[PDB]
Amino acid sequence: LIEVFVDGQSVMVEPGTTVLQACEKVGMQIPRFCYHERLSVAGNCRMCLVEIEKAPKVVAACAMPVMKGWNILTNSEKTKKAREGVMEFLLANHPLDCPICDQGGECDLQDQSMMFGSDRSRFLEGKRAVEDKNIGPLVKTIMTRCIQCTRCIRFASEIAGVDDLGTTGRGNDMQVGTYIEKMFMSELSGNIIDICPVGALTXXXXXXXXXXXXXXXXXXXXXXXXXXXXXXXXXXXXXXXXXXXXXXXXXXXXXXXXXXXX
Amino acid sequence: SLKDEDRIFTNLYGRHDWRLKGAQSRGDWYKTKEILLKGPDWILGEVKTSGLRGRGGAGFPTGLKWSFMNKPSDGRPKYLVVNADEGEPGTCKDREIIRHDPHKLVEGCLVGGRAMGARAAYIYIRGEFYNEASNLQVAIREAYEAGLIGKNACGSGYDFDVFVVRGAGAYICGEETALIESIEGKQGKPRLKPPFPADVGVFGCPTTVANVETVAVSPTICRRGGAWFASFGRERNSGTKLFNISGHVNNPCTVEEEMSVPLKELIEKHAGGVTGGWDNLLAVIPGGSSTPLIPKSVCETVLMDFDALIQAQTGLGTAAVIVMDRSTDIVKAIARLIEFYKHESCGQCTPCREGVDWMNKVMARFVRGDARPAEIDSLWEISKQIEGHTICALGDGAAWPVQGLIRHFRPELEERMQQFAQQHQ
Amino acid sequence: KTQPYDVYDQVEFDVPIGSRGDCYDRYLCRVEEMRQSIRIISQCLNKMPPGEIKVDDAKVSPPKRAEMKTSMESLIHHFKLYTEGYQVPPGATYTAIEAPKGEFGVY
Amino acid sequence: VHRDTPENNPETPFDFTPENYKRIEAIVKNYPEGHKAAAVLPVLDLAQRQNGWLPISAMNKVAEILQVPPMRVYEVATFYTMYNRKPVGKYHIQVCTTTPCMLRNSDSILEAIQKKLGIKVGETTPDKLFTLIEVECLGACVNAPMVQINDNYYEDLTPKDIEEIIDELKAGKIPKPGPRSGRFSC
Amino acid sequence: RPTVRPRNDVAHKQLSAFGEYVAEILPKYVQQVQVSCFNELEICIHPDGVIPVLTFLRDHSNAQFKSLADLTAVDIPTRQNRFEIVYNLLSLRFNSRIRVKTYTDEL
Amino acid sequence: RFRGEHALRRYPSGEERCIACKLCEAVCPAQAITIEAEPRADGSRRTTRYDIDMTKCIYCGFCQEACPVDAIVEGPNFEFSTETHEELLYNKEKLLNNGDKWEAEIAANIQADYLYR
Amino acid sequence: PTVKPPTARKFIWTNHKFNLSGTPQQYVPYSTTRKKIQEWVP
Numbered sequence A: 001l002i003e004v005f006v007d008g009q010s011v012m013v014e015p016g017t018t019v020l021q022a023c024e025k026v027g028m029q030i031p032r033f034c035y036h037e038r039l040s041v042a043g044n045c046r047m048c049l050v051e052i053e054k055a056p057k058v059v060a061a062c063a064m065p066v067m068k069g070w071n072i073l074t075n076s077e078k079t080k081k082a083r084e085g086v087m088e089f090l091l092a093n094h095p096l097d098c099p100i101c102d103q104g105g106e107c108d109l110q111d112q113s114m115m116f117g118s119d120r121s122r123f124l125e126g127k128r129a130v131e132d133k134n135i136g137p138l139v140k141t142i143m144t145r146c147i148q149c150t151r152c153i154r155f156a157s158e159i160a161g162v163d164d165l166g167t168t169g170r171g172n173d174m175q176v177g178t179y180i181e182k183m184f185m186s187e188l189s190g191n192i193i194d195i196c197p198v199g200a201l202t203x204x205x206x207x208x209x210x211x212x213x214x215x216x217x218x219x220x221x222x223x224x225x226x227x228x229x230x231x232x233x234x235x236x237x238x239x240x241x242x243x244x245x246x247x248x249x250x251x252x253x254x255x256x257x258x259x260x261x262x
Numbered sequence B: 001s002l003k004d005e006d007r008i009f010t011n012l013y014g015r016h017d018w019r020l021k022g023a024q025s026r027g028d029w030y031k032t033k034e035i036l037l038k039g040p041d042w043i044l045g046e047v048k049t050s051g052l053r054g055r056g057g058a059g060f061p062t063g064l065k066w067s068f069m070n071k072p073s074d075g076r077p078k079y080l081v082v083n084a085d086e087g088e089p090g091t092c093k094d095r096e097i098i099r100h101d102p103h104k105l106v107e108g109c110l111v112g113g114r115a116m117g118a119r120a121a122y123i124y125i126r127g128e129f130y131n132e133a134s135n136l137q138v139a140i141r142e143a144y145e146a147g148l149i150g151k152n153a154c155g156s157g158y159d160f161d162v163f164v165v166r167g168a169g170a171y172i173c174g175e176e177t178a179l180i181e182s183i184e185g186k187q188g189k190p191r192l193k194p195p196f197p198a199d200v201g202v203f204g205c206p207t208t209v210a211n212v213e214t215v216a217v218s219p220t221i222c223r224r225g226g227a228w229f230a231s232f233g234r235e236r237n238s239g240t241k242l243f244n245i246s247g248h249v250n251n252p253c254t255v256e257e258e259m260s261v262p263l264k265e266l267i268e269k270h271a272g273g274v275t276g277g278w279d280n281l282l283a284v285i286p287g288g289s290s291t292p293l294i295p296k297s298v299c300e301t302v303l304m305d306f307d308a309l310i311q312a313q314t315g316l317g318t319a320a321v322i323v324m325d326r327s328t329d330i331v332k333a334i335a336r337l338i339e340f341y342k343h344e345s346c347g348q349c350t351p352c353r354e355g356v357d358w359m360n361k362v363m364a365r366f367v368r369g370d371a372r373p374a375e376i377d378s379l380w381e382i383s384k385q386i387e388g389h390t391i392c393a394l395g396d397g398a399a400w401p402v403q404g405l406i407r408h409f410r411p412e413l414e415e416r417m418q419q420f421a422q423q424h425q
Numbered sequence C: 001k002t003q004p005y006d007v008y009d010q011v012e013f014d015v016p017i018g019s020r021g022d023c024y025d026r027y028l029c030r031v032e033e034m035r036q037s038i039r040i041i042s043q044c045l046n047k048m049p050p051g052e053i054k055v056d057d058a059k060v061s062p063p064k065r066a067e068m069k070t071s072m073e074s075l076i077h078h079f080k081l082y083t084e085g086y087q088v089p090p091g092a093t094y095t096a097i098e099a100p101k102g103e104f105g106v107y
Numbered sequence D: 001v002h003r004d005t006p007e008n009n010p011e012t013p014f015d016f017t018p019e020n021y022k023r024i025e026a027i028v029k030n031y032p033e034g035h036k037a038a039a040v041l042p043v044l045d046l047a048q049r050q051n052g053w054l055p056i057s058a059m060n061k062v063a064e065i066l067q068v069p070p071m072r073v074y075e076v077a078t079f080y081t082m083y084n085r086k087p088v089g090k091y092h093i094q095v096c097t098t099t100p101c102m103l104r105n106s107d108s109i110l111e112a113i114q115k116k117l118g119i120k121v122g123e124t125t126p127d128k129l130f131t132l133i134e135v136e137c138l139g140a141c142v143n144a145p146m147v148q149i150n151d152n153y154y155e156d157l158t159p160k161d162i163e164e165i166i167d168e169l170k171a172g173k174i175p176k177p178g179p180r181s182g183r184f185s186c
Numbered sequence E: 001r002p003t004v005r006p007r008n009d010v011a012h013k014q015l016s017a018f019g020e021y022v023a024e025i026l027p028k029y030v031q032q033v034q035v036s037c038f039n040e041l042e043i044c045i046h047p048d049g050v051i052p053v054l055t056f057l058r059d060h061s062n063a064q065f066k067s068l069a070d071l072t073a074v075d076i077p078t079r080q081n082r083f084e085i086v087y088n089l090l091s092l093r094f095n096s097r098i099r100v101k102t103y104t105d106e107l
Numbered sequence F: 001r002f003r004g005e006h007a008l009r010r011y012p013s014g015e016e017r018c019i020a021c022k023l024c025e026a027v028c029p030a031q032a033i034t035i036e037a038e039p040r041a042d043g044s045r046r047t048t049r050y051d052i053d054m055t056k057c058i059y060c061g062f063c064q065e066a067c068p069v070d071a072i073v074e075g076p077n078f079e080f081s082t083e084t085h086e087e088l089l090y091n092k093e094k095l096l097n098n099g100d101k102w103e104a105e106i107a108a109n110i111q112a113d114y115l116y117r
Numbered sequence G: 001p002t003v004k005p006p007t008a009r010k011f012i013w014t015n016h017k018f019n020l021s022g023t024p025q026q027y028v029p030y031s032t033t034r035k036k037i038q039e040w041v042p
């Protein structure tokens, strides 16, 4: 194992370890949109851009490995100028749903604007809207709220099995939908709503019932379907309405059962 | 020290009369058996000793790029990749290197086959240029059947098979990572460049990306002496590259010219509109679409070489002249260049899909004159940002020409905003 | 006079101090505070630079109502400055600004 | 429209080429033998040439021959610009409007063609003979105007020469390359 | 910075002299930890002797505090030692604010 | 601009202006406002439970400020006197929607509120 | 009724109402939720 110092502090990492994976050992979380837990490593956003000690261009954390003993700073001058910029590009074509939107506090993009992005102003005029994609029982999908990334695209191809989500256009018109009018299969694809960072894919059964603000969470193993453990259930006064998958090491691979999610 | 234009020297001269056997009399496959008998290390050294720059719009040297793969030990069989499709607008190299002389392009794959160590060679052509693609397919039938390349030909142990594939006609032929993904079968989107280049993994194989003009120069450099290619040009950049002039001109024509050549001498030979740089206002771009437009004051000092072009504003990479007259609009012309990137944006990196589309919408307002005088300075900060935080080189290609509006100009942009402010408001 | 809070020492202040610690002289100074308080209010009317009302940085104060309805980042910050608090820097701080009764030593 | 697909009268009915089926199988052999998805990019271009206006069900049948995902193969033709989306006539021509062509007037060639061959710009002919569409770049930028019809691209045309070539194309093919001046150097 | 920064550090090095001066005596009985941030000084004190620390700062030739005015306490269950009684002290002659803390569980 | 008894406003062409966010719920320093939301018939999703306690509520205008749609607008109110707590604490909208008698003044007062004073 | 006119929207009440007080036809609290359903049938 080769050791390379990140933010002056030295941390030992594997030879084929990612930059964001190396950052976790130093106890620092970079701004993410494309996963690092179970979903395959892919670019297609350039948010997790980090500047090296002696480099003209910033490298993405998901793709570029550490390899050689090179210094990388998380709270650098170039990184903060990058992070504020990319956030503005994400929100130049964003439909503005925040009070109506199913997520609110649970939304990863909502937090990153508060934590990293530029606050005072955002230069934008005229945003494009996408037509609503067809969906069956679970997840009332809205294509407008989607940021057009690669998270749910690879989820159907690798984690779920049956592929449906992909690319539809080229510019700021490419939709994450199925293109052909067909309802999504069950199996384990009910967990796709929990995967997406934006408030685009969210469960239709418990839609707009309770916000992320004011909800008491408790972890409990699911009774329906065997080998199910660690599932957070929000109380939100009297009766529980929303049940989300809790992180587990061996019992479950961060995905709830389709029968248990509804 | 000074470079002379052509003077009975060209990489590809046959354009009027060439088919299959007619090209052979006028320098084609002269040392085909000699290059095949020579070792892979000695053949690769010939390109490195000459010091030839990359013909494609990047700036990277061709000698270092071919030697980057090398292949010491390989599990998966290696494959050769070549791009022939038109990427940047204003380039005439796509319908000249393959359309006029198809025998020269096919010989380039055979010369680089034994050097790199590839089992099969692949070429990508434009979907819109179907007539030019038919000439390349006809040359492959005259080479494989007769005995030029395939299994065992011209006294060679290494086998190489040539196959041409029709492209979609977008950014898939643009980026080096994009060509590997397009040929594989997946959607037109480039792979992540930071961790693995073409050598580490491309379509499940070690590969190398090469331009149509870059691959065609390889058999010419191998047959002739190494000093002949390095004779014309500068110390840093050497080798003759095909330059094409398009737009406001007396006669639009593509002609081969030597490196480190002045812009005033090249425009005078092809004959431009009104004047070379006295009566008509200079708005010519050194690159096809990548490089921003050169100023009226600095044009005579600018050279065709990439090393000399980097000193003033931005370096020429595509090498194509896009001259505009004084009567022609400047604001509307550059806005159309960004609109090209609006359609040729692939849909991956977020400061490009929702970036260039945001950039074009603001730029369309400058033609009308509804934009504020303060909005000019704000747009410059955004334009610089796209250049750094993108995976492929097309993100840079849309970023550079917008930077050439704030630089050099500015009173031309302010006059359009001031005119609509008094007339309408 | 000793510790400025928000633009002090620039405004002319008069502090009444007596001699005897009885209830009458402790009452006289309060009336002398009242007669020498309009001087500050008049100087507040004299010096008023037109500009911002809230902090321009939208991580502390919510943006304008006309601003939030059109632009994107403004409404997301409006959504997070309300419900969720401020995200404060950690540390113990003590401040005391002169109350007419005494002090408000917030810790 | 790019994402949405109509279900009425163009969703179930589809036909595949029988005579060119042997030629399509040989095209798959040109690439790698094991794990071949490259044939899907080649068959999509072959389907448009054989049958006019590609159907949604026809792409699913083409994906079944190579054995690939139906959603992934449908998305592969969505990114491409050369492939037909809805409907195309007997001879469809696309005009270039980019800055290397716009500098020596390109909009004048499109406006003259719009009045001679009818319709605005996006709308096609009602009798189905010629369809007009805005193109990014034709490829060859040697001539000041460029327009690619069916397969062969016609370059270099005047205000009256473009209208004369369009009306003649209704009955007999007009060939041509750059009918205004020398091809290489002038 | 114009609106982003509250005040530039200038008296921070001057207040750091107090962080050395009391620490120059160096008692394990008294001193322990000295923290200085945002124009303020913080000292925590060993439980065995709190009165000898409070007799100091009272009177004294170098610095005259006298007023040991406001008195707070912190409840925190993270540490093995629970409560943290915090003294807020103010000087009239010197014009400075210093802090005295206790580290013991004090059940 | 004066804060009294709470009343929720609506659009000029029917439709309840309150969108159900729980935004005003969390800002409320008294926790007087409660909100539980369900989908309205088909398509639209606007409220079901909406109780504001007058036993609580210290009157801030915070719920007026936190509201992005401007539903709760504080009208010039003084008249409120009851026999019981039950009569005093506001029910599921209804009595809040009955603020139509004050909404004519609210519409006039909000015209002095956009671009503040 | 002289200079500034009241805005019409057809949502506001046409006839003005007096205070609720301790008199009949006054203010009242009401339940909102449909609650958790439970049913048993032969």
Ligand SMILES: Cc1cc2nc3c(=O)[nH]c(=O)nc-3n(C[C@H](O)[C@H](O)[C@H](O)COP(=O)(O)O)c2cc1C
Residues within 6 Å of the ligand: B054, B055, B056, B057, B058, B060, B062, B065, B083, B084, B085, B086, B087, B088, B173, B174, B175, B176, B177, B209, B210, B211, B212, B214, B290, B393, B394, B397
């Ligand atoms: C907008 C843009 C378009 C490009 N288009 C092409 C192209 O069509 N063909 C090509 O060979 N190179 C093209 N390039 C250059 C690529 O970067 C190329 O893959 C490689 O890096 C250059 O090396 P080569 O000369 O050995 O091909 C393009 C670059 C940019 C920025």
Ligand code: SF4
Residues within 6 Å of the ligand: A094, A096, A097, A098, A099, A101, A102, A103, A104, A105, A107, A108, A109, A110, A145, A197, A198, A199, A200, C076
């Ligand atoms: S996706 Fe997130 S940031 Fe966007 S409107 Fe919904 S909650 Fe707000």
Ligand code: SF4
Residues within 6 Å of the ligand: A146, A147, A148, A149, A150, A151, A152, A153, A176, A195, A196, A197, A198, A200, A201
């Ligand atoms: S729906 Fe969500 S996960 Fe899928 S592409 Fe859009 S933002 Fe990414």
Ligand code: SF4
Residues within 6 Å of the ligand: B171, B190, B344, B345, B346, B347, B348, B349, B350, B352, B353, B390, B391, B392, B393, B394, B395
């Ligand atoms: S920069 Fe633009 S065109 Fe290039 S890979 Fe990223 S999104 Fe695609």
Ligand code: SF4
Residues within 6 Å of the ligand: A099, F017, F018, F019, F020, F021, F022, F023, F024, F025, F035, F066, F067, F068, F069, F070, F071, F072
């Ligand atoms: S009053 Fe306003 S903030 Fe509160 S739930 Fe209704 S719309 Fe949302």
Ligand code: SF4
Residues within 6 Å of the ligand: F027, F028, F029, F030, F031, F032, F033, F052, F056, F057, F058, F059, F060, F061, F062, F063, F064
């Ligand atoms: S005025 Fe204040 S206390 Fe009353 S409901 Fe609104 S936020 Fe709550």
Ligand code: FES
Residues within 6 Å of the ligand: A031, A032, A033, A034, A035, A042, A043, A044, A045, A046, A047, A048, A060, A061, A062, A063
């Ligand atoms: S978060 Fe790393 S590329 Fe998107």
Ligand code: FES
Residues within 6 Å of the ligand: B089, B090, B091, D096, D097, D098, D099, D100, D101, D136, D137, D138, D139, D140, D141, D146
């Ligand atoms: S720019 Fe018009 S043909 Fe290339």
